[PDB]
Scaffold this motif. Structure first.
Motif, PDB file in Angstrom:
ATOM      1  N   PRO A   1       6.902   1.440  18.340  1.00  0.00           N
ATOM      2  CA  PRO A   1       5.855   2.083  17.551  1.00  0.00           C
ATOM      3  C   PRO A   1       5.402   1.135  16.447  1.00  0.00           C
ATOM      4  O   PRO A   1       5.832  -0.011  16.368  1.00  0.00           O
TER       5      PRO A   1
ATOM      6  N   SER B   1      18.869  12.109   2.723  1.00  0.00           N
ATOM      7  CA  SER B   1      18.857  10.982   3.640  1.00  0.00           C
ATOM      8  C   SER B   1      17.424  10.599   3.992  1.00  0.00           C
ATOM      9  O   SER B   1      16.491  11.397   3.884  1.00  0.00           O
ATOM     10  N   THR B   2      17.261   9.354   4.426  1.00  0.00           N
ATOM     11  CA  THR B   2      15.998   8.670   4.670  1.00  0.00           C
ATOM     12  C   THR B   2      15.347   8.221   3.364  1.00  0.00           C
ATOM     13  O   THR B   2      14.336   7.520   3.407  1.00  0.00           O
TER      14      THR B   2
ATOM     15  N   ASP C   1       2.965   6.280 -13.912  1.00  0.00           N
ATOM     16  CA  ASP C   1       1.862   6.438 -12.981  1.00  0.00           C
ATOM     17  C   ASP C   1       2.059   7.694 -12.137  1.00  0.00           C
ATOM     18  O   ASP C   1       3.189   8.142 -11.926  1.00  0.00           O
ATOM     19  N   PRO C   2       0.970   8.284 -11.645  1.00  0.00           N
ATOM     20  CA  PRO C   2       1.117   9.478 -10.800  1.00  0.00           C
ATOM     21  C   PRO C   2       1.969   9.241  -9.567  1.00  0.00           C
ATOM     22  O   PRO C   2       2.729  10.131  -9.166  1.00  0.00           O
ATOM     23  N   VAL C   3       1.871   8.064  -8.957  1.00  0.00           N
ATOM     24  CA  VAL C   3       2.534   7.784  -7.692  1.00  0.00           C
ATOM     25  C   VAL C   3       3.847   7.037  -7.893  1.00  0.00           C
ATOM     26  O   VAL C   3       4.825   7.298  -7.193  1.00  0.00           O
TER      27      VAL C   3
ATOM     28  N   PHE D   1      -0.171  -0.280  15.381  1.00  0.00           N
ATOM     29  CA  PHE D   1      -0.131   0.500  16.606  1.00  0.00           C
ATOM     30  C   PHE D   1       1.043   0.077  17.477  1.00  0.00           C
ATOM     31  O   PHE D   1       1.537  -1.047  17.370  1.00  0.00           O
ATOM     32  N   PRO D   2       1.513   0.960  18.356  1.00  0.00           N
ATOM     33  CA  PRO D   2       2.651   0.611  19.214  1.00  0.00           C
ATOM     34  C   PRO D   2       2.301  -0.513  20.179  1.00  0.00           C
ATOM     35  O   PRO D   2       1.147  -0.677  20.580  1.00  0.00           O
TER      36      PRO D   2
ATOM     37  N   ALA E   1       8.245  10.573  -9.867  1.00  0.00           N
ATOM     38  CA  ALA E   1       8.046  10.535  -8.424  1.00  0.00           C
ATOM     39  C   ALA E   1       9.151   9.770  -7.710  1.00  0.00           C
ATOM     40  O   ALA E   1       9.499  10.116  -6.576  1.00  0.00           O
TER      41      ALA E   1
ATOM     42  N   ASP F   1       0.809  -1.215   0.000  1.00  0.00           N
ATOM     43  CA  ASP F   1       0.000   0.000   0.000  1.00  0.00           C
ATOM     44  C   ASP F   1       0.845   1.269   0.000  1.00  0.00           C
ATOM     45  O   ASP F   1       0.412   2.303   0.511  1.00  0.00           O
ATOM     46  N   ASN F   2       2.043   1.206  -0.572  1.00  0.00           N
ATOM     47  CA  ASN F   2       2.972   2.331  -0.578  1.00  0.00           C
ATOM     48  C   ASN F   2       3.169   2.889   0.830  1.00  0.00           C
ATOM     49  O   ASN F   2       2.835   4.036   1.129  1.00  0.00           O
ATOM     50  N   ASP F   3       3.719   2.051   1.701  1.00  0.00           N
ATOM     51  CA  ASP F   3       4.068   2.443   3.059  1.00  0.00           C
ATOM     52  C   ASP F   3       5.581   2.548   3.173  1.00  0.00           C
ATOM     53  O   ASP F   3       6.303   1.653   2.726  1.00  0.00           O
ATOM     54  N   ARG F   4       6.059   3.644   3.758  1.00  0.00           N
ATOM     55  CA  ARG F   4       7.490   3.785   3.985  1.00  0.00           C
ATOM     56  C   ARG F   4       7.954   3.082   5.249  1.00  0.00           C
ATOM     57  O   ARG F   4       9.163   2.909   5.432  1.00  0.00           O
ATOM     58  N   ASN F   5       7.035   2.680   6.122  1.00  0.00           N
ATOM     59  CA  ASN F   5       7.398   1.909   7.302  1.00  0.00           C
ATOM     60  C   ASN F   5       7.441   0.416   6.996  1.00  0.00           C
ATOM     61  O   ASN F   5       8.402  -0.270   7.361  1.00  0.00           O
TER      62      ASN F   5
END
Ligand SMILES: [N-]=[N+]=NC[C@H]1O[C@H](O[C@H]2O[C@H](CO)[C@@H](O)[C@H](O)[C@H]2O)[C@H](O)[C@@H](O)[C@@H]1O
Ligand SMILES: [N-]=[N+]=NC[C@H]1O[C@H](O[C@H]2O[C@H](CO)[C@@H](O)[C@H](O)[C@H]2O)[C@H](O)[C@@H](O)[C@@H]1O
Ligand SMILES: [N-]=[N+]=NC[C@H]1O[C@H](O[C@H]2O[C@H](CO)[C@@H](O)[C@H](O)[C@H]2O)[C@H](O)[C@@H](O)[C@@H]1O
Ligand code: CA
Ligand code: CA
Ligand code: CA
Lengths: 547, 547, 547
Positions: free
Chosen positions: B536, B439-440, B422-424, B498-499, B429, B351-355
């Motif tokens: 987290p 960085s990151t 694609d837009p994303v 959730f944490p 992008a 789902d395009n999550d950076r975590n």
């Protein structure tokens, strides 16, 4: 209503590549009723729709799987009726292609056939052992197919495909197949469609010994179909196709004595592959000779002049062994698709040079017969040859230069094809929103040429007579209508790069004033001494020759 | 020259889709010599290479039409030698894929084995008759094919094609088909290459009644090939493609008593489809039961952990019918093919999550065995489902976003595929030039993770223990290396949005200080009481557990 | 709603750079009523509006040229009334700006005073004869101005322009100008809006000798204006702004004994330029010590915290020589404008560390002051710094990746300032439409944080206790609410890159279960012994401490 096929210009609006009205990344019938104003503004009276029926798109949709249902991608058959109603209440005629001589290998009539010998749908297709029958017929696709017979496992026999490996030609001898390929012709005409084309007519019947094409047995069926159309619903243009030597083999018009009992209109295939030859050869014979050789024509049939279509410039038997010249001229960077054609659109074929473009537009707008325009070619697009098949001539039309060339409002990945991005013929270099404004854009120039081609009812019901002068690199002709006080006209088209002097011999119209058409600049009176003119490179005039 | 099977990260760089140094629209082996620097800048040591042999690119390049020459498009074999010479000097090991189960339906062998048997190549293929033979194995591609036998018009017989019907499986019973295939290796290993990855090994020798896969006799030829590799040119990493049930069959290693006499490594296929079904279900059990249910392995071979490759994604043919909820979660798109049906890449899956992406990269670099890196995952690339076949996961790499994604300097319409737009997930992008400074950015997070994983030899040659805790939504390890005063390490990966609080059971390590690996910020000394942590959403730590 | 500014979140929206409802090339009031759903969907509860009155746009629109007229290109007073009567329908309150101590050199007042030394408008401005009077003030715009006295050759005298050359100061000593400057307020309130951001308050009266800043008479005049706004039009707030040293220098609240007789809020300039240095210095002192050094506040006034606004970083007069450190860390390239803060927006100031941005949003919404967001911080937007002056911080918004960033449909030359194009920051990479899909997008994270902060009446109307632990590099709050069973809340925020252990002394809340807010994941019951929590780099927790 009148004949209406003498006075008309046809448009090849591929149901795909025009507009996406639902964000499905593909054409749509309801997506054409919203751009059915650009056509009327452009001044186009009859629209022509290639087939769109349920047909797994292995070859441009000419693989019908049902002749009774619109492909679900292109809206239902309750949207074709809407398109017809919207294009009739605006003064436009639409003709839908009908293709015989094959069927995709998915029609129930084929699956239930190969699995059921002796069943009703058993002999519809041509099944016969051995690879010797009809051993003299030529093979069209010299790239993909190489046998013309193939082998069917489930029945283990052979089958007769004339075009591809998945298009088994129907065996028309069975006098029941010519009641299910005719009940379609008696159905779509019930929706109000004004006339329907016939595709690949020459290859219907095939018998041993002969060449298997244009046998003196196809014409019996064509006459039967024409009689059916006349008796059931009068007034439809049974457009046809020849792609044959001019000779007498292209004449599907019937017996001249009756006047007409067959196709109401043909296509000028003999001349299409020679206009370019003449233009690059710097002469006029490659066109004058070709227009002279073709025999006469009945008094109720047009001639269907055109330049390009959704095929690859079929440089076949229609051309003699001078194909080796057009290959070396228009087909560098090897792109010979089969032994036929070059697979390139009109604009790329001419270095994008504007002059040659308007010269060819004039040539197809004046020469004998109605013109047929591909949906593009009024913007200067094309190319993108590298795609699979001959799909370099079906890229989506390039409207406003937004994302995905303004074709639709979906992802740039869901499009059935990517809009071109060539540095020259891109979607950010040749648009419709970037050309409808400038007053000298090619779109507007062709619109003007169409405008001045409707104020003289002499370009459509006229005649032809090549005058000819000392200079051989330019031609002239006079489309004079019949009757007293004829609506005479004149045309002087150059065919070289530079400007040349012309000595015409219009003395036969002495005491006439050549009133111009672009600006009504009264030219000098038509004296007796050789009439003189000087034209620029690839220039032309459209006089009026009034008293 | 050590084992080096263990202390190594693998990059799945396709020859195409990587660079273009000839301005033609396709990756070139000369397009890697001047790009290898980037790989050395990302912390890689072994660069993979899928099939690139002379062959019609009808499927990926596995449709081999020759086993001896490189495809003319990708330069010449001298270019391959130059690549080896210029990549070994950087200490980067290159290993190529090798397909031996089949050759395409255009090889000289298949042709001379067709239309004229009784010759030397009469039974280089499994020629049979009737659709009742080996009728137990399932059909892999259950979306296109329907019979798995097929026919042949030139001999009327049947051939046992397993995959596609244009690369028939060779008949391996002859002691001639498998005496030349062992010569392909003889040649390729002479160029300095380091090992090979066998393609579709399980599907060697078949027999009636069985499933034709993993038959007790295939391992005979596997041991023969291992002996051939070891006797001549000693020290070449092999691999395997074992997509079978967990440890029940996948075990493809030599005799445990004798150390090793089969594949030097393996690909942990049973794990891949679970790393996902555990993160989506919010639990750690599915990642623990199947990491324990697998039997052990000889202490001379690794376990080839990877997370994504060029396939239909998360192969779901060897997992029970309760992998039928990886359709309602990870396959919401109504586009699923080949009985597993995802065909996406890593980034769009989550789902395009950076975590989640960083969590999965940590797991890939942490779990047992050397990891395999897919070329487009150090940027954050996406995918295009509507491209047909699995090519949707092979779009050209998205470098700088200037022109056609900096991939090549040719016509945008000439590339074999259009760079994503694609837009994303596009070449605007996500880029390498746009993520090589800030960085990151994943291109830097992954680089730092790899640089930290190359200084603590406890993830490669380390043991494994599941500490477990009161929380059913987080998993802990101890990747300690067996020995006296070894290099211990800890990992505690969360699996909940959730944490969460975690109460581990590290009492076995009492009086150790978990010096964190990232910044060395010491933690509380481990006490007999349970150690308490908080996390987290989707976080992790890498503690060093120093003495 | 006697106050309504405690349970409220403000959003600074420059009327330009937000939309274009008529293709003008600039913002529009009718182009803002269209978008009062994105703001209302985000959760904002009181809009903001910088100057828009009829005036030359020479200095960010602060060169007023009239007081009762809306700029012609932003619409008319009818459009503003429509905006006020629409935003007042979707539970949204509007507060506008106001300039009191300057007026561009085109107002009728100044053109009438320039000549005509004796007349009704001859004493509406400061005028002298030598440039020595008031020789103890600050040259605010140290970069361009050099004297602070300008000549005005028409009259041959000197005038005292505070900020910029063409912005002559009013002369409030006159008992007449203090009447127009109240009639304007009365009218603008009469339209219907509520609130006022009294601007440049600490410069009104310029006395001799002193620095001319916060002169005792300024507070008397402000008391008069507040009484005027309170006796009639009851229920209207009115903000203020200091940018001065904390304490009596920010006494712009009322007399503590009387409850309040001055501004109803303030802008916490003492603290904003300190969050950055606290985060970059990896410590908690610069925030806690400063929040403790600020004197108390009248019980019926908010404190209005913020993080960035349309001006520069404004790090001067509120910073010691510690600013010399910030210039060396937050701006290495020569992009320091004036002798005050730097011309950069939030995102590029921190790099793209999404952790830092999320942490800053948490600090902004958590600390004592009410939040004030600035458009473009809600997502990750950049800033072009070569545009000159301080407009590089007011670039047009970026809604979608369409032409000219979906800002406006007009020709891409009308726009005052081109939308950014940098590789990392641009309208192709950070689009409010490309981030409304994913549920981890920074926009969605901010929306969720605002939604949660609205459900606990203890983030704005609660006390503030700091706790402190063993690590300086962490910050702790307990935003309890006065009274029984107040919605107590705890906050722990990290300020160091690497993960950190954290032992806090919560002995006053024994027998309290810290239920987390984001997911309601119950945590261990509060321990009399130091509570211990481990937090990842740049992380935060929001516990609820239920009973
Ligand atoms: N190649 N070529 N040649 C010209 C020849 O064939 C055409 O084929 C087009 O139309 C058929 C009809 O089904 C379709 O199958 C092909 O895909 C088209 O290229 C014309 O049909 C025929 O009239 C021409 O003589
Ligand atoms: N589809 N599928 N699945 C998994 C498949 O993986 C290997 O397949 C390789 O070879 C095929 C043949 O072309 C190719 O399509 C795949 O991309 C390759 O990974 C093995 O065949 C076997 O392990 C699995 O069935
Ligand atoms: N930068 N700075 N300046 C001084 C002052 O700025 C604000 O007030 C105005 O200052 C100028 C003149 O209009 C303009 O740049 C600002 O946008 C105005 O708000 C505030 O008073 C405060 O930031 C400073 O004291
Ligand atoms: Ca036929
Ligand atoms: Ca086999
Ligand atoms: Ca003043």
């Amino acid at each position: 209503d009148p004949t209406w096929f003498k006075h008309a210009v046809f448009y090849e609006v591929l149901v795909r590549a025009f507009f996406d009205a639902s964000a499905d990344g593909s054409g749509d019938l309801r997506g054409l009723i919203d751009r059915l104003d650009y056509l009327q503004w452009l001044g186009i009276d009859c629209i022509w729709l290639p087939p769109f029926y349920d047909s797994p798109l292995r070859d441009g949709g000419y693989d019908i799987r049902d002749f009774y249902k619109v492909l679900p991608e292109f809206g239902t058959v309750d949207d074709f009726v809407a398109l017809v109603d919207a294009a009739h209440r605006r003064g436009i005629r639409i003709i839908t292609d009908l293709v015989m001589n094959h069927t995709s290998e998915s029609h129930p009539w084929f699956q239930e056939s190969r699995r059921d010998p002796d069943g009703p749908y058993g002999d519809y297709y041509v099944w016969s052992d051995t690879s010797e029958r009809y051993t003299d017929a030529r093979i069209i696709f010299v790239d993909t197919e190489e046998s013309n017979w193939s082998f069917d496992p489930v029945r283990r026999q052979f089958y007769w495909h004339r075009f591809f490996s998945h298009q088994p030609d129907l065996n028309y001898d069975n006098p029941a197949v010519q009641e299910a390929m005719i009940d379609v012709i008696r159905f779509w005409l019930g929706l109000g469609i004004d006339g329907f084309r016939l595709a690949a007519v020459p290859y219907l019947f095939e018998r041993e010994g002969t060449n298997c094409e244009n046998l003196p047995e196809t014409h019996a069926f064509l006459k039967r179909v024409r009689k059916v159309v006349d008796d059931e619903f009068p007034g439809r243009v049974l457009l046809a196709e020849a792609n044959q030597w001019p000779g007498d083999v292209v004449e599907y018009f019937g017996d001249p004595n009756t006047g007409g009992d067959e196709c109401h209109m043909a296509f000028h295939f003999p001349l299409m592959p020679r206009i370019f030859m003449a233009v690059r050869r710097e002469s006029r014979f490659p066109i004058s000779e070709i227009i002279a050789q073709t025999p006469p024509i009945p008094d109720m049939a047009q001639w269907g002049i055109f330049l390009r279509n959704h095929d690859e410039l079929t440089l076949e038997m229609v051309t003699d062994e001078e194909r080796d010249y057009m290959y070396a001229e228009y087909a560098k960077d090897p792109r010979m698709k089969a032994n036929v054609g070059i697979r390139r659109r009109l604009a790329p074929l001419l270095d994008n040079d504007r002059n040659q473009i308007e010269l060819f537009t004039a040539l197809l707008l004046s020469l004998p017969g109605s013109p047929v325009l591909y949906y593009g070619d009024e913007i200067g697009m094309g190319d993108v040859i590298w795609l699979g098949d001959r799909d370099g001539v079906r890229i989506p039309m390039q409207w406003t230069p937004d994302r995905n060339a303004g074709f639709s409002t979906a992802n740039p990945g869901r499009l059935y094809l990517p809009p071109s991005q060539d540095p020259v013929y891109g979607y950010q270099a040749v648009n419709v929103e970037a050309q409808r404004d400038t007053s000298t854009s090619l779109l507007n120039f062709t619109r003007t040429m169409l405008a001045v081609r409707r104020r003289h009812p002499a370009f459509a019901v006229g005649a032809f007579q090549e005058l000819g002068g000392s200079n051989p690199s330019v031609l002239a002709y006079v489309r004079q209508v019949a009757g007293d006080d004829g609506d005479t006209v004149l045309c002087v088209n150059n065919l070289s790069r530079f400007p040349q002097p012309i000595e015409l011999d219009l003395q036969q119209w002495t005491n006439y004033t050549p009133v111009e058409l672009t600006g009504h600049v009264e030219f000098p009176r038509i004296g007796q001494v050789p009439y003189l003119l000087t034209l620029p490179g690839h220039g032309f005039y459209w006089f009026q020759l009034t008293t």
